[PDB]
Structure 1
Amino acid sequence: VFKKVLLTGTSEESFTAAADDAIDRAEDTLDNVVWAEVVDQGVAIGAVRTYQTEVQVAFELD
């Protein structure tokens, strides 16, 4: 059985690096992280631009 958690990663560099930020967090906390699916991307536009990539991060249960 796989389970997915819905995480939004952030980066001041790129959409790829924002996906990684979410995956990094998942791997800190979860065992058996196996894949991620991009579901949305955006940019917070303030003092700097922050690229955001929202991913479903799949991990194998047990």
Structure 2
Amino acid sequence: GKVYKKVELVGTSEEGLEAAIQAALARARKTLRHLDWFEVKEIRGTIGEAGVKEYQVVLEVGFRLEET
């Protein structure tokens, strides 16, 4: 049937988790076609000094491969 590929990215943002997810996906869309789903693997981040500096979300992005 169809075949998909998964790439692992890390999105970062000062805004929050959804924004860091959206950041990776926005960059993914520049170079990968047929983006279909994602799976969060890790949530981490840096500290300083209003608390969280940046949120870092490690995620797999899954996309459909074309025929050839």
- TM-score, normalised to structure 1's length? 0.91
Look up the SS of the partner of 1:31 in the other structure.
coil
Q: How many residues get paired?
A: 62
Look up the SS of the partner of 1:16 in the other structure.
helix
Aligned equivalent of 2:31: 29
Aligned-CA RMSD value: 1.3
For residues 1-62 of structure 1, what are the structure 2 equivalents within 5 Å? 1-46=3-48, 49-62=53-66
Deviation at 1:37, TM superposition (A): 0.5
Deviation at 1:25, TM superposition (A): 1.0
Same amino acid, percent of matched pairs: 45
Cα distance per residue 1:16-52 (max 9 Å; x no partner): 1001111111111110000110010011124661001
- Where do 4+ consecutive residues of structure 1 move more than 6 Å? none
Q: Distance in 2 between matches of 1:40 and 1:16?
A: 13
Structure 2: tracts of 5 or more residues without a match: none
